[PDB]
RNA sequence: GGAGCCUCGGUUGGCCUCGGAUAGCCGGUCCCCCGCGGGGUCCGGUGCGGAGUGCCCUUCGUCCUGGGAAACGGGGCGCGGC
RNA sequence: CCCCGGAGCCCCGCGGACGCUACGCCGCGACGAGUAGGAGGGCCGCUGCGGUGAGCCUUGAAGCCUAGGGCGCGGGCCCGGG
RNA sequence: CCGCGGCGGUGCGCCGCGACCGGCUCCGGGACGGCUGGGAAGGCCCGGCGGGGAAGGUGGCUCGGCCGAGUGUUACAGCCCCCCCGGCAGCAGCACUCGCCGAAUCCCGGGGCCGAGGGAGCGAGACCCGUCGCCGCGCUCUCCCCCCUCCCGGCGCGCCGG
């Protein structure tokens, strides 16, 4: 009856300064700020979630405007608890600086 | 084409190349078991001497 | 000097190179030393017949 | 969901940095009482440095030119915008989240307003160094509404005193009420101090 | 048929040896001095006039197709699910408490009972308190809390097992085409057997939780994150 | 109150002293001055800050009956005045 | 101490691909910047002649158009509708 | 037609799992070698032998209530420090993490990610199939015994006989 996903931003794609690489996001996870406090999240399932004009289906439900691109937090990005994910399609850049729900549910706990 | 599986990791591959590794690595488990025990009995004898 | 780094290896270094990255040069084709019968075939004339002998 | 930082006692470009990066991650940020913000290095120094910036202008048609805002709010907002990608859409989208103020007006006068210590003068300057107050610097460079901002803010602080006083009174009541009550709350309060509060 | 005469030191490496084994098994003393045309192979039948016929068990194919795939290559390892070894996070002991994350018992707290054959967890949030019946869950979608009831001694029925926790309906043909056929049927009904089994388990567990103070309430409550709180930081 | 295109973000709140930094915070004044408060001194407390944003508040299944602790609190987008 | 028109087969010398357009098919390795310039292969393409498809075509050729469907690294090509 | 028996290839669309192998990337454990056969340290103390900062001391002055605090001087040991002779088991590159270098003197277990890329059966009365190399083992065709006890059988949850 409440939230079951730790919040995270999608900060952008993996990149060198002058060369972007779209297939590999950088998620800033809320409240985690050290390549130390980011083991937990490795292996986890994450979802850019959003909605659109035409309906879609929905697992365990009637048709609905919301869609997601699933992903997976793959590994731990540079020092300040930033992380890397890898989604099943690449994220759309409209997303840059929005929410992507990171789940708990591939747990090693 | 033959897949090179790494012997260092893959126990059996190691053996197929160098069969003696089985014995070496039988020891240095047992050798270490021996030595782990001995350290427990030392630690017991230090706790007993402290008591 | 400026192009290479070099030095005197360990034993371990030899093994870790030869098992993990050791490939024969057999009929000029690079070939992974998967089995001893590749080393022997080409160095048997020298009493070198298995991975272990090569390291030695 | 909103960051309200009291601009006071920060270092101009130090706080800007943090704000920029926040604003680009999609945090709606409000800075406030910018005229409190203080820039490292001595005053005369910085006035001169603003006066360079006023010297800059397109010869042929000044009207097109670098738009030297005089208001210390704007001045901060200009220096965030220098730490953003503001030609793009995403940089302009970010900049529309930053909200800045000359003093501190009604929506955020009654808000717990944060501080960034990494931008804080008392942390980042050595205490034997000089620093401008932006308020002064704006003032001498052409900002009008210093006195008006000040004299509204006296009226803000007086009103706040009252709020605080009344808070203090409720806190004193609570303390007294716990002392009145303690015996009938003992086997709660105990558990909150076995699991690490109250102590 | 004796068991293994050496133990395991580590996967694949025997504790003993060859020659230390030679002694144990005793390869000394256990030495074994040991120095169609007309006749049809596999058909045969009876029958009346002309005599008895010879059939042929397994008669060759009435048709071949024009092209076909050609074998594979043996592959060595790779072992059908049934035979796989199973696992379990050490944090999950019998009669631990879980947070079942993912299904319609989403965030519901619950009591773990046993590992099934499958690999899944048998679980129950004694349907009474929580509204979570005798159900399976997958290790993976399940936070293990550090709260444990001493479930130790409860005869969780033998007959309840991976097979009986398994979905059921639907066969092939019927009327099919139109606006009918198994779009109806409609409901999963619960079955008396299942209601008995739940009863039998609940009665046994339920006291144990009521012996712990608060725990029944804890269990009723749903897990859920909120503001100012982080999975990585907190603990279960 | 009923349907019905479209646009999307979100997925507990925090309702506030001023400020100081080679210092602060809170009490209570027995006592004194000013307009229940403000200022003062004095004393008593805290001060790696628990009268702590390392915080605080808020709870997250629904109902039944039939005991205790707690108990006059909550509501009717309850209604009129200051 | 015997014969494969039957040892039953991990090797079979009695006969041999699902495979074998031998300008075919298969397996190992290593390698792959390129103007000027050279060479190779194009089941890339245009027009015409000898052959050849018991080719296609008024039950619709050529050409033209195409938010239709495909192939090809590509040159280009095949389809659907008009 | 029911068998979803055996084999072969498949999934309409979206998904999830599992175990195996390849590769990485980390984590947690332990066992060892060497050295100035490590340096320091710790712990028990005893006997001596000196030297110095500076002391339960004394002294001039100051500041507080003979006592406490702050400066100052000569300086023994009744605060320590230092060297010199002689001797104990507690060490151990030490979870009292003070300072290395290492592993045939070295092994165990766990997690994250990416990947699967190949296909030694096209016989007419007898397999639609295994398997090569390596590990061992494991078992058996050799006998004994002991334990625990799952199925089943027997006797009183306990005991006895796969
Ligand atoms: Mg929604
Ligand atoms: Mg080239």
TrEMBL record, chain E:
GO terms for cellular component: cytosolic large ribosomal subunit; rough endoplasmic reticulum. One of its GO terms (molecular function) is structural constituent of ribosome. Its main location: cytoplasm. Residues 1-43 form the Large ribosomal subunit protein uL6 N-terminal domain. One of its GO terms (biological process) is ribosomal large subunit assembly. Component of the large ribosomal subunit. The ribosome is a large ribonucleoprotein complex responsible for the synthesis of proteins in the cell. Component of the large ribosomal subunit. May bind IPO9 with low affinity. This is 60S ribosomal protein L6. It comes from Oryctolagus cuniculus. The chain holds residues 44 to 276 of 276 of the full protein.
């Amino acid at each position: 009856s409440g939230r079951l996903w730790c919040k995270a931003i999608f900060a952008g794609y993996k990149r060198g300064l002058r060369n972007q690489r779209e297939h590999t996001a950088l998620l800033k996870i809320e409240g985690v700020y050290a390549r130390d406090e980011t083991e937990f999240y490795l292996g986890k399932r994450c979802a850019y979630v959003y909605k659109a004009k035409n309906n879609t289906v929905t697992p365990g439900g009637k048709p609905n405007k919301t869609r997601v691109i699933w992903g997976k937090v793959t590994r731990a990005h540079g020092n300040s608890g930033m992380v890397r994910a890898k989604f099943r399609s690449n994220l759309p850049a409209k997303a840059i600086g929005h929410r992507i729900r990171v789940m708990l549910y591939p747990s090693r706990i | 084409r033959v897949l090179k599986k790494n012997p260092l990791k893959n126990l059996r591959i190691m053996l197929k190349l160098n069969p003696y590794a089985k014995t070496m690595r039988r020891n240095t488990i047992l050798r270490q078991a021996r030595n782990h025990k001995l350290r427990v009995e030392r630690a017991a004898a230090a706790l007993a001497a402290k008591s | 000097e400026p192009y290479i780094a070099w030095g005197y290896p360990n034993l371990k270094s030899v093994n870790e190179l030869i098992y993990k990255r050791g490939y024969g040069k057999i009929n000029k084709k690079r070939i992974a030393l998967t089995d001893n019968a590749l080393i022997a075939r080409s160095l048997g004339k020298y009493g070198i017949i298995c991975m272990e002998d090569l390291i030695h | 969901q909103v960051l309200v930082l009291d601009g006071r006692g920060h270092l101009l470009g130090r706080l800007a940095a943090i704000v920029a990066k926040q604003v680009l991650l999609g945090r709606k940020v409000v800075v406030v009482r910018c005229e409190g913000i203080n820039i490292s290095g001595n005053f005369y120094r910085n006035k001169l440095k603003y006066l360079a910036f006023l010297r800059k202008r397109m010869n042929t048609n000044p009207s097109r030119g670098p738009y030297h805002f005089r208001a210390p709010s704007r001045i901060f907002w200009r220096t965030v915008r220098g730490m953003l990608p503001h030609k793009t859409k995403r940089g302009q989208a970010a900049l529309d989240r930053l909200k800045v103020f000359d003093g501190i007006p009604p929506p955020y006068d009654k808000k717990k307003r944060m501080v960034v210590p990494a931008a804080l003068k008392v942390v980042r300057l050595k205490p034997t160094r000089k620093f401008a107050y932006l308020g002064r610097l704006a003032h001498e460079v052409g900002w009008k509404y210093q006195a008006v901002t000040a004299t509204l803010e006296e009226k803000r602080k007086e009103k706040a005193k009252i709020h605080y006083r009344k808070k203090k009174q409720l806190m004193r009541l609570r303390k007294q009420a716990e002392k009145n009550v303690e015996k009938k709350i003992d086997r709660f309060t105990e558990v909150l101090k076995t699991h690490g509060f109250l102590v | 048929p004796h068991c293994s005469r050496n133990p395991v030191l580590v996967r694949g490496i025997g504790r003993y040896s060859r020659s230390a084994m030679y002694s144990r098994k005793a390869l000394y003393k256990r030495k074994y001095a040991a120095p169609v045309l007309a006749t049809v192979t596999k058909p045969v039948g009876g029958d009346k006039n002309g005599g008895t016929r010879v059939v042929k068990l397994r008669k060759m194919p009435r048709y071949y197709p024009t092209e076909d795939v050609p074998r594979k290559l043996l592959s060595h390892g790779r072992k059908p699910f049934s035979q796989h070894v199973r696992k379990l996070r050490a944090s999950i002991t019998p009669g631990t408490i879980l947070i079942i994350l993912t299904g319609r018992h989403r965030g519901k707290r619950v009591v773990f009972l046993k590992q099934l054959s499958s690999g899944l967890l048998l679980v129950t949030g004694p349907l009474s308190l929580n509204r979570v019946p005798l159900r399976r869950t997958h290790q993976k979608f399940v936070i293990a809390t550090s709260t444990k009831i001493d479930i130790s001694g409860v005869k969780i029925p033998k007959h309840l097992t991976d097979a009986y926790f398994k979905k059921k309906q639907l066969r092939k043909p019927r009327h099919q085409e139109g606006e009918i056929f198994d779009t109806e049927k409609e409901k999963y009904e619960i079955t008396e057997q299942r209601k008995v089994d739940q009863k039998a388990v609940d009665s046994q567990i339920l006291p144990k939780i009521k012996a712990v103070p608060q725990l029944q309430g804890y269990l009723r409550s749903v897990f859920a994150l909120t503001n100012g709180v982080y999975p990585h930081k907190l603990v279960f």
